[PDB]
Amino acid sequence: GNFKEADDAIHYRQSAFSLMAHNFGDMGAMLKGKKPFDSEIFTMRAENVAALSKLPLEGFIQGSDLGDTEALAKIWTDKSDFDAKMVSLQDNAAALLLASASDDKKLLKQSFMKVAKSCKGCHDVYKKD
Amino acid sequence: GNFKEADDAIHYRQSAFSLMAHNFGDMGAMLKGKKPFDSEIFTMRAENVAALSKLPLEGFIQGSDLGDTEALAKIWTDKSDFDAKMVSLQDNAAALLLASASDDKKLLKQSFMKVAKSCKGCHDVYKKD
Ligand code: HEC
Ligand code: HEC
Helix, strand or coil, rough: CCCHHHHHHHHHHHHHHHHHHHHHHHHHHHHHCCCCCCCCHHHHHHHHHHHCCCCCCHHHCCCCCCCCEEEEHHHCCCCCHHHHHHHHHHHHHHHHHCCCCCCCCCHHHHHHHHHHHHHHHHHHHCCCC | CCCHHHHHHHHHHHHHHHHHHHHHHHHHHHCCCCCCCCCCHHHHHHHHHHHHCCCCHCCCCCCCCCCCCCCCHHHHHHCHHHHHHHHHHHHHHHHHHHCCCCCCCHHHHHHHHHHHHHHHHHHHHHCHH
């Protein structure tokens, strides 16, 4: 495989998510009024999350459920469904990036939330309590 | 104000570099003959590197030279030149992604090395030996 050890695959997927959470939260902060809204920065954040959302799936190689991971082994008993959720995260991220082109705020908030729903949705099922 | 703590920016940039190295190295492996060349996979790897290359600069905030980092203190004293090199990496990584559209290996190899020199060039000056 691409990764020399499972720890390399675990580290890879964790970094992809961590970089994605940093960029996603900055959009949330702008939407929730915590910091000023900047369209250019918002679209940059959208670009980042979309590109980042394409990385972590590769990290979920088989046999990487043990060790320092928050991934539940149920990911690989239902890998078909897990991949589907990840593909949806990408589609929802791609939609958010398109919305960031327009300055309709109610369109930005809802397309943002459809992504947030992906984050929470997959975590509830496949990430340790 | 994006990062609550200095440790968060250090982790952010370190993760970006890590994910870029994984994808960039797979391009070298195909170009250098370690693994077979796949045009489609090459372009995906190029896409990842181009997007990943736009992330780490944000991480180099003030006061983040202390702690568990490989960044030298000279980066901030020479921040103008450091930013220019990073923006150059972004430009070169974007150039590599454009090359992957071409089927010319002599261009693919050449554009890959212009990115490779960006990595080595900045490490020699701005990363602890
Ligand atoms: C399933 C298809 C997921 C989607 C969609 C998102 N995430 Fe997730 N995330 C998932 C797993 C299986 C894990 C565990 C990784 C491990 O091996 O530990 C995670 C982890 C995270 C983390 C923690 C990463 C770390 O620092 O160790 C974060 C911060 C995170 N995920 C954020 C995140 C966001 C912001 C998402 C939407 C924008 C998102 N994830 C989607 C599974 C899945
Ligand atoms: C400066 C302008 C850089 C360019 C261009 C590239 N890298 Fe770099 N890299 C740089 C610094 C200052 C650091 C240290 C960051 C820290 O706070 O510790 C790094 C680190 C890396 C790492 C290690 C990441 C980790 O696991 O901690 C890797 C794997 C890495 N850099 C790779 C890399 C590649 C492949 C580059 C070109 C494609 C590249 N870097 C460019 C500074 C700079």
